[PDB]
Design a protein around this ligand. Structure first.
Ligand SMILES: CCS(=O)(=O)Nc1cc(-c2cc(NC3CNC3)c(=O)n(C)c2)cc2c1ccn2C(C)(c1ccccn1)c1ccccn1
Length: 127
């Protein structure tokens, strides 16, 4: 099986804006998670061919990763903050679906998710 192409990250047919909350999501939320010790397996799409994980894309049909999220924020792909938050949540839930509870990768995702939820509790004021 091939890897699928990565998720779309730039679409000039989508309207674009900068907002307080989107700026925060890139400069605080993504930045804080990206520098974490456990961020590295989540910084790009799961490379199922390289890892010899042939069944990954047989069950994960909405892949997501922080590299994709970063590029979506840099290319003004999201209009609403919640679209970006939803992508982070998809990334965590995919990990909790494919991997057994308590596995190393799940514990890594759970550490990142705890920090993510703290930072989302400090989302700044909307325009
Ligand atoms: C940067 C993205 S990458 O694909 O290029 N690199 C990687 C992504 C994922 C990965 C695996 C998932 N699942 C696997 C772990 N057992 C089933 C999963 O869900 N995610 C989100 C990520 C794991 C990766 C790598 C590169 C090496 N690792 C190993 C050392 C790893 C890291 C952390 C925890 C467990 N194992 C590894 C080696 C061999 C096979 C699978 N993993």
């Amino acid at each position: 099986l091939e890897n699928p192409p990565p998720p779309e990250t730039s679409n000039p047919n989508k309207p674009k804006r900068q907002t307080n909350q989107l700026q925060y999501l890139l400069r605080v939320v993504l930045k804080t998670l990206w520098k974490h010790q456990f961020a590295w397996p989540f910084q790009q799409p799961v490379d199922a061919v390289k890892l010899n994980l042939p069944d990954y894309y047989k069950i994960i049909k909405t892949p997501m990763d922080m590299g994709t999220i970063k590029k979506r924020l840099e290319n003004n792909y999201y209009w609403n903050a919640q679209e970006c938050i939803q992508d982070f949540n998809t990334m965590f839930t995919n990990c909790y679906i494919y991997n057994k509870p308590g596995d190393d990768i799940v514990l890594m995702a759970e550490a990142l998710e705890k920090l993510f939820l703290q930072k989302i509790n400090e989302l700044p004021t909307e325009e």
